[PDB]
Design a binder for this molecule. Structure first.
Ligand SMILES: NC(=O)OC[C@@H](O)C[C@H](NC(=O)[C@H]1NCCC[C@H]1O)C(=O)N[C@@H](Cc1c[nH]cn1)C(=O)N[C@H](C(=O)O)[C@H](O)c1c[nH]c(Cl)n1
Ligand SMILES: [K+]
Ligand SMILES: [K+]
Ligand SMILES: [K+]
Ligand SMILES: [K+]
Ligand SMILES: [K+]
Ligand SMILES: [K+]
Ligand SMILES: [K+]
Ligand SMILES: [K+]
Ligand SMILES: [K+]
Ligand SMILES: [K+]
Ligand SMILES: [K+]
Ligand SMILES: [Mg+2]
Ligand SMILES: [Mg+2]
Ligand SMILES: [Mg+2]
Ligand SMILES: [Mg+2]
Ligand SMILES: [Mg+2]
Ligand SMILES: [Mg+2]
Ligand SMILES: [Mg+2]
Ligand SMILES: [Mg+2]
Ligand SMILES: [Mg+2]
Ligand SMILES: [Mg+2]
Ligand SMILES: [Mg+2]
Ligand SMILES: [Mg+2]
Ligand SMILES: [Mg+2]
Ligand SMILES: [Mg+2]
Ligand SMILES: [Mg+2]
Ligand SMILES: [Mg+2]
Ligand SMILES: [Mg+2]
Ligand SMILES: [Mg+2]
Ligand SMILES: [Mg+2]
Ligand SMILES: [Mg+2]
Ligand SMILES: [Mg+2]
Ligand SMILES: [Mg+2]
Ligand SMILES: [Mg+2]
Ligand SMILES: [Mg+2]
Ligand SMILES: [Mg+2]
Lengths: 78, 121, 155, 129, 70, 205
RNA sequence: GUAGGUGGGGUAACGGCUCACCUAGGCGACGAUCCCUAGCUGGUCUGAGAGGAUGACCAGCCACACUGGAACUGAGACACGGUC
RNA sequence: CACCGGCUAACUCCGUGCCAGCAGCCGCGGUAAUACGGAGGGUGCAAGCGUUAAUCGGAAUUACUGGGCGUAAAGCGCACGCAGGCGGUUUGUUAAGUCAGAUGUGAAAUCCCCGGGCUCAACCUGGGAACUGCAUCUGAUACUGGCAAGCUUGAGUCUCGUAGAGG
RNA sequence: UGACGCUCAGGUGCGAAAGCGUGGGGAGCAAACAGGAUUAGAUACCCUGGUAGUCCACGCCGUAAACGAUGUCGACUUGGAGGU
């Protein structure tokens, strides 16, 4: 149900992708809306995602040291 | 400064130092007099002003003003110093507390006695 | 009219003999009901300097639209290096102003105001900035007039 | 380059009023026309018109009252380098509600008063007084 | 009511900047003396070799005030 | 913790009758009210704006008999309370039991009233209160205790209060020796000589 | 073991937690790494506010128990007044 | 208990004579010192009063609110240019930013408001308000962003010609 | 043609004169220096000479009151007299 949408920035790991989730946040002091990036290691069972793809992801149990997110679907192919 | 420049590098507040570093944020410090002497003040004024070089417990060697008329301090006197610049003496950032430890009160004082460590007659 | 001495300054011009000293006098006057003016007098003696200032102040009185002993809205005044800010206050606040601004606001008949003086606080330039503030203030009725509306439509 | 057409429009009104111009003209846009409509109905300008087709041009007829310009001040608030948005409860009163703030809400560009009564916040385009 | 000084004669052995002087006293001790205010105000010049009265203090016997020049 | 020194010196410094004597005799007959106290008192120097503010504050303090810390607290309360701080401040001072006892006419001065209170001679709603700063509220009945009804100073103090302007916000009964604090005094009910806005400004520094 | 994978082992439990093998990744100017300082918070002080400073008392959380290791017992400890 | 030259409420006499000393800053003291020391008088606080330390304020003196850069401190010697910031105009679409409503949460204490209890107060306490936040759901779609298709006014290309101590 | 734009930390290049390296060149000029004066002194200004250098090639240096002591780009806002 609860998902993040972001862009694939690596696919060099077996069954794993790095996904960048871009956020647009008001700066606390100065009030300018800044772009902030959360990078997440995500599980990609079938190795379907390539770099540039837009992917929907969901939070799951730990799968490795760094992985606690899994691929839902590819929204847009690159 | 533009908003975007402040985002990249915020307003740095100036790190204002103490005027009384040898106290180390204590209201007084004890010390031992290493020398007790007189010094001539800066141009407009003239006097022989009573001072002492004091080795503090925390190991800072500082100069302290000995206020009031007349004092009993010698080398190896143990004194309490407070904060207090004397404008017309370079480097004198501390006053000796009168009527504390080895430093006597001022003789025959009747006004501002509490500033010079003198009991009520 | 109410009258108030703000500052008296001894000024000096060098001549071949030595120095000719003379006195300046910043004063303000007002009715305590919207009208206020400032004057600046020069003389060789202080009492003459004051009287000159008072006479100039009496003839250079502006009008101000006050809302029952306070301002209509926040106002910013500037003159030279003096930048002043004033805003309306509720009854019983009193005049929360500094030095020169208070004198102006007192005699003008502003009982309740919150004020601050930024930049230079030279009395001469502060008084001008203050009165510059009060003259550029707008009532509801005159805002309604220029905009071609009623007071109800504006407010 | 030109990066704020709205600031430009406001500057044209401000400069035009300072130079006692009868009217000011500029390249039109839907948003400019929207702001122009607020200015007109609040009575800070007399009228406006759009002329052209491929390259439309907005003309504004400036008001004067007893010689003096009606637009005392006109300030760009939200700008490209720093966008400003406000919730309905924190909509700014300009000149203790003698001026207007022009607010882009989800129900179109309007005054802060109308945004409050509608019960909407939005982007604070400009102050006018 | 003030504490008392020790007057003593001496010869100015050298002049120093800003009306400061080395003065060898009667007892043979060299003090760094300074000019009095009254002598400064009245423009009494002091030179190397001049015989001077020096007011000393018991608080410091390396310092003095030149109050008279003979 | 109280001022125990000479009274008329205070009146002289303010340049007004602070009512610190009973008022059987005129203040000019007991002292030189026009002249400030001391050697250099015949001089009348020009007083600064700060000095005007201070002397207004000290006037009100000296009337009621309140030291600075307690007065500053009364100011903080007035600032907090809704409405006019200046009017609130004077209401609080008028609330005080020592004042109320005086205004009813049981003490000849506020100092004599303060002693009555302090010496457990006053009851608020039938209960002994010996705190001078006790805030009396509307519809409270201040009274003299049966032991203190015989006190000759209380008989005399009533006769003095008959001379003075009677408070409209109180209602005393001389035979009973009790009175009802009907309401809080309005700003109109108190004297116009007090420029309370000067105190408001003084503390706004 | 660094990042991921596969398989075995391990844990109350997911997991490089561990191991073997395979792949060559992973993090970093949106400040990694390194150095210095520091228990965190509710709050507290100051300030018109926005801020700034602070984290004593009280209450929540964490860490430590002469110093460095280690486990045992137990529902729970790697245990202030337990063990080696 | 401190203070009484100004800031800063409060002034005289005597002693001293740039000495002794005072002092936060400006300053005071060299013979008639309201500034030193004492005294009389006064002012401010008061079971405290001063002094020191420390923080914020005043300081718009790091300026988001809320500052500057010709000469006061401050435009890189000049350009090109990657990252980054910013983006003319129209339609559709999306709904990230944004806005609205709702739900959950935001410990108690503390702060604030209206009450209550200790003779009053401090203090204790009932209820409320507040906790400006975070998440989710449902909506809104002007503006900003994404996506798609355009448009020609920004920016380029081509044609012809001109001046020039440009290299 | 159809927003392809503006700005730009880091980066890259250009950057007077002096200076540096290597090899040429060297009329005039001229730091240093030599002599002649002046003067209280004259390590100067003045006079007569004079080396580096000034010139060329290639490489280096990266600074100047490198100034409009005024960053770049865009829009808007009365006039007058000139130059090209
Ligand atoms: N030497 C010493 O220690 O002190 C003496 C000095 O003060 C002399 C004085 N000098 C000057 O002004 C210099 N001006 C610059 C050029 C050289 C020189 O001339 C002077 O008066 N000169 C005279 C000539 C002279 C030199 N020695 C004796 N007489 C002179 O004619 N000076 C001219 C002037 O003062 O306007 C001018 O400077 C000048 C022209 N031609 C020459 Cl040479 N000098
Ligand atoms: K002096
Ligand atoms: K109030
Ligand atoms: K590992
Ligand atoms: K594994
Ligand atoms: K905090
Ligand atoms: K340990
Ligand atoms: K057990
Ligand atoms: K700013
Ligand atoms: K949109
Ligand atoms: K770029
Ligand atoms: K040569
Ligand atoms: Mg983890
Ligand atoms: Mg007390
Ligand atoms: Mg620590
Ligand atoms: Mg502030
Ligand atoms: Mg177990
Ligand atoms: Mg433990
Ligand atoms: Mg145990
Ligand atoms: Mg133990
Ligand atoms: Mg004297
Ligand atoms: Mg600040
Ligand atoms: Mg500045
Ligand atoms: Mg300069
Ligand atoms: Mg400069
Ligand atoms: Mg430049
Ligand atoms: Mg756009
Ligand atoms: Mg949204
Ligand atoms: Mg709570
Ligand atoms: Mg769009
Ligand atoms: Mg550029
Ligand atoms: Mg060269
Ligand atoms: Mg060469
Ligand atoms: Mg030559
Ligand atoms: Mg030559
Ligand atoms: Mg440079
Ligand atoms: Mg420069």
């Amino acid at each position: 149900i609860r998902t993040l949408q972001g862009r694939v920035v690596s696919d060099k790991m077996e069954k794993s992708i790095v996904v960048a989730i871009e956020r647009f946040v008001k700066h606390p002091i100065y009030g300018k809306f800044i772009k902030r990036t959360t990078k997440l290691h995500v599980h990609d069972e079938n190795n379907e995602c390539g770099i540039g793809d837009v992917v929907e992801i969901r939070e799951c149990r730990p799968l490795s040291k760094t992985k606690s997110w899994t691929l839902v679907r590819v929204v847009e192919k690159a | 400064a533009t908003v975007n420049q402040l985002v990249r590098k915020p307003r740095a507040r100036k790190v204002a130092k103490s005027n009384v570093p040898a106290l180390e944020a204590c209201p007084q410090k004890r010390g031992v007099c290493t020398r007790v002497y007189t010094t001539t003040p800066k141009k407009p004024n003239s006097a022989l002003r009573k001072v002492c070089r004091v080795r503090l417990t925390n190991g800072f060697e500082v100069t302290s003003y000995i206020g009031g008329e007349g004092h009993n301090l010698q080398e190896h006197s143990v004194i309490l110093i407070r904060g207090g610049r004397v404008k017309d003496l370079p480097g004198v950032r501390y006053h000796t507390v009168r009527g504390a430890l080895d430093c006597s009160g001022v003789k025959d004082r009747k006004q501002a006695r509490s500033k010079y460590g003198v009991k009520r007659p | 009219l109410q009258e108030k001495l703000i500052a008296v300054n001894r000024v000096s011009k060098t001549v071949k003999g030595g120095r000719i000293f003379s006195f300046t006098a910043l004063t303000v006057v007002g009715d305590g009901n919207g009208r206020v003016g400032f004057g600046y007098g020069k003389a060789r003696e202080v009492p003459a300097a004051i009287q000159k200032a008072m006479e100039k102040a009496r003839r250079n009185m502006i009008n101000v639209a006050l809302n029952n002993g306070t301002l209509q809205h926040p106002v910013k005044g500037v003159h030279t290096g003096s930048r002043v800010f004033m805003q309306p206050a509720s009854e019983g606040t009193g005049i929360i102003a500094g030095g020169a601004m208070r004198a102006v606001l007192e005699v003008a008949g502003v009982h309740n105001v919150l004020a601050k003086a930024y930049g230079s606080t030279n009395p001469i330039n502060v008084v001008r900035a203050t009165i510059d503030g009060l003259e550029n203030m707008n009532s509801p009725e005159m805002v309604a007039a220029k905009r071609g509306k009623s007071v109800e439509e504006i407010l | 380059s030109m990066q704020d057409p709205i600031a430009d429009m406001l500057t044209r009104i401000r400069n035009g009023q300072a130079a006692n111009k009868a009217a000011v003209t500029m390249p039109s846009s839907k948003l400019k026309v929207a702001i122009a409509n607020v200015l007109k109905e609040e009575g800070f300008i007399e009228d406006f018109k759009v002329e052209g087709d491929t390259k439309p041009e907005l003309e504004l007829t400036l008001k004067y009252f007893q010689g003096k310009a009606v637009v005392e001040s006109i300030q760009r608030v939200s700008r490209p380098g720093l966008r400003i948005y406000k919730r309905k409860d924190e909509l700014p009163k300009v000149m203790a509600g003698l001026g207007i703030a022009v607010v882009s809400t989800s129900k179109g560009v309007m005054t802060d008063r109308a945004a409050r009564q509608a019960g909407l916040g939005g982007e604070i385009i400009c102050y006018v007084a | 009511a003030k504490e008392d000084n020790i007057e003593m004669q001496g010869t100015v052995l050298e002049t120093l900047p800003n009306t400061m002087f080395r003065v060898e006293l009667e007892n043979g001790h060299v003090v760094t003396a300074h000019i009095s205010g009254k002598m400064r105000k009245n423009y009494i010049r002091i030179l190397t070799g001049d015989k001077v009265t020096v007011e000393l203090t018991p608080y410091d016997l390396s310092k003095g005030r030149i109050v008279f020049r003979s | 913790a109280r001022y125990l020194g000479p009274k008329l010196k205070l009146s002289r410094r303010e340049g007004t009758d602070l009512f610190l004597k009973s008022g059987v005799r005129a203040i000019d007959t007991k002292c030189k009210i026009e002249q400030a106290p001391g050697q250099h008192g015949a001089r009348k120097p020009r007083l600064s704006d700060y000095g005007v503010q201070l002397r207004e504050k000290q006037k009100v303090r000296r009337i009621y008999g309140v030291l600075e810390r307690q007065f500053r607290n009364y100011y903080k309360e007035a600032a907090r309370l809704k409405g006019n701080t200046g009017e609130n401040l004077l209401a609080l001072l008028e609330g005080r039991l020592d004042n109320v006892v005086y205004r009813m006419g049981f003490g000849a001065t506020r100092a004599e009233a303060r002693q009555l209170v302090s010496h457990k001679a006053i009851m608020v709603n039938g209960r002994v209160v010996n705190i001078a700063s006790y805030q009396v509220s509307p519809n409270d009945v201040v009274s003299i205790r049966e032991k203190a009804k015989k006190q000759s100073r209380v008989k005399a103090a009533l006769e003095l209060a008959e001379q003075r302007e009677k408070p409209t916000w109180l209602e005393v009964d001389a035979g009973k020796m009790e009175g009802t604090f009907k309401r809080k005094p309005e700003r109109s009910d108190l004297s116009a000589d007090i420029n309370e806005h000067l105190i408001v400004e003084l503390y706004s520094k």
